[PDB]
Amino acid sequence: YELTQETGVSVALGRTVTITCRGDSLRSHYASWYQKKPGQAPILLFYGKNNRPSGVPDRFSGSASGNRASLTISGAQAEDDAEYYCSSRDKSGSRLSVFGGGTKLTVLSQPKAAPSVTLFPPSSEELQANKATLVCLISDFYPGAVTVAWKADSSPVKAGVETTTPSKQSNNKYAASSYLSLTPEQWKSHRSYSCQVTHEGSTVEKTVAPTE
Amino acid sequence: QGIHFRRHYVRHLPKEVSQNDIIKALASPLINDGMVVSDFADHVITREQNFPTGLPVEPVGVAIPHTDSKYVRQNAISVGILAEPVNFEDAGGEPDPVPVRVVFMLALGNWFDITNVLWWIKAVIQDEDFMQQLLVMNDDEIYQSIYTRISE
Amino acid sequence: EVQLVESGGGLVKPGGSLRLSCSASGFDFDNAWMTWVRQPPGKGLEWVGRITGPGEGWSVDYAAPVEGRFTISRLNSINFLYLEMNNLRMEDSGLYFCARTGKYYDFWSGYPPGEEYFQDWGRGTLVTVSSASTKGPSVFPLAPTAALGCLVKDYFPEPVTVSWNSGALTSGVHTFPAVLQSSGLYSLSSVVTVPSSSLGTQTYICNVNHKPSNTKVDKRVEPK
């Protein structure tokens, strides 16, 4: 991304939190800031040097310095729990625009909870058909932001990975699943595969080896 | 580049004139040539009354009146040199007026021209030597110099 | 008061073409800049392109992955904006938003050409690129508190409904969202965590139902 944003940020209710957007084009251009909730249209929060649209809570404030744009939320409310995108030019002087990666802002409403990770190997009925699939299951975590990575022996796998965006579930904790597809004449080859899962800074690993 | 700048878009304005007198004098060649709509001056003064453009730069105050680009037919600039300093409200939220002696009327309908011309103006009004020349040069020489650097 | 109603999204084949429309109301559309933004599955907002106004001769700019394949146009008499998408690629899939676009330039600190910002957004129209025809899923058991699930692999299109033990076992059963694989086929997983004191008595069955293919499958999940 030309504009880098934190993947996720937590704030206690009523406390102040700042999220940031960083990139070379911000040395010459201002950023604008957007809020987006699952399934809803984004809304403009702030743009330019000091412009807040009417109807936006005045607790949202933008600022900027060097290659950095900040959105500060003074006194976070439960209704602020959302995704936040920055936008600016992709390069100084450009007619194009670009978005940062988005920051998931969690306004804490329950205790933090590490995820429970299960990694399923391809079933034998599934390998009968010349097909194999690793199914890593991640459930009961809070906040709802998790980075998944796959490994073969000890080397990263980015090809053939599919990971679902964390879905909100009943208890308002979160679930997510991840799939690593490959051929049977490939899973029996490696010593072991691993689903590594990063949550709130700590990383857990589940490993399977072709043996059953 | 796609900006129309003719010799008669440069004027020296005499002593007794007010803000509205200057806006009407500078708009006059633009309307005569069809660069703007007939009520363009009304739209500038209205916009100036609510969104001032006085720039309190030294040695000489500058103003940059304009309106919405929908009232512009073709890109053009009109330039006034004031014999006496006429006050303009500060474009940045001050009661202290700006004693303006150089007026850049912008009649640009194209956004990419608007930002480039404003960028150029910001550089030019920080050039004391250039601003000094504008207060002594005649209309032709003002036209020649400005025509050169907005060509580029 | 502003509404931006997008339409035209649906299933389309790679290499094919698709036209999106957006009907705008509640603002001066003649003079407004208009932008398309897309959200690929599981990703963030992505700028697609923007058409300017009459002062700029309606010039358009495009995002790099899209330049030379997409055409943005407008018809101001009916307040419509259009996106014509040619030579579609799998990674063009996503939710496509139309956005009313403002312009900002601060005199003393600005740099040309200033910045654009998106002051009103539609709710988007969904585009799915895939060469897959309708296909029923293959249901593989995921043998093992103890977690036991069903892999619902390689179906098209959406949706699939999954129940456990025929509409009885419901305690702690997260049926996960499906993912659109590189093949253009979908896969989802459905699991149920249950104490190990129950994998010797009553057996566990998942009921998969895929209407567009007239498919229904019951798979037992028992340990080896």
Side-chain angles (χ1 to χ4, degrees), chain A residues 28-32 46-52 89, chain B residues 111 114-115 118, chain C residues 33 101-117 119:
Chain A
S28 314
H29 301 282
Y30 290 102
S32 54
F46 204 91
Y47 65 97
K49 186 172 170 175
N50 54 22
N51 295 83
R52 175 187 302 116
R89 302 299 189 185
Chain B
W111 171 258
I114 284 174
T115 61
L118 296 173
Chain C
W33 288 20
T101 303
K103 294 155 291 183
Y104 178 83
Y105 182 84
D106 175 70
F107 182 84
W108 284 112
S109 66
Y111 194 72
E115 301 68 55
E116 297 161 44
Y117 58 93
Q119 40 177 303

Side-chain angles (χ1 to χ4, degrees), chain A residues 115-130 132-150 152-157:
Chain A
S116 66
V117 188
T118 310
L119 178 49
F120 283 115
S123 64
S124 284
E125 304 91 333
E126 182 188 333
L127 289 172
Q128 288 181 15
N130 251 359
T133 305
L134 296 166
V135 186
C136 184
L137 280 238
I138 312 162
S139 189
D140 291 312
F141 55 99
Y142 186 82
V146 165
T147 302
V148 199
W150 287 92
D153 301 280
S154 57
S155 295
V157 193

Side-chain angles (χ1 to χ4, degrees), chain B residues 80-83 85-88 90-148:
Chain B
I81 305 298
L82 309 179
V86 180
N87 295 16
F88 281 66
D90 185 288
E94 245 58 39
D96 22 316
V98 177
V100 167
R101 290 192 66 208
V102 178
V103 181
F104 296 106
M105 169 162 287
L106 301 192
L108 308 159
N110 179 308
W111 171 258
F112 307 108
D113 295 329
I114 284 174
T115 61
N116 279 326
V117 167
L118 296 173
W119 174 258
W120 173 74
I121 286 174
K122 164 171 150 292
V124 131
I125 69 191
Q126 303 183 268
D127 189 346
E128 291 176 335
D129 175 56
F130 183 86
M131 297 306 293
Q132 209 68 228
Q133 292 285 294
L134 291 181
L135 305 172
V136 291
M137 278 172 155
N138 65 38
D139 296 335
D140 206 21
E141 290 168 322
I142 294 170
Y143 160 77
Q144 254 321 314
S145 37
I146 288 174
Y147 183 94
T148 286

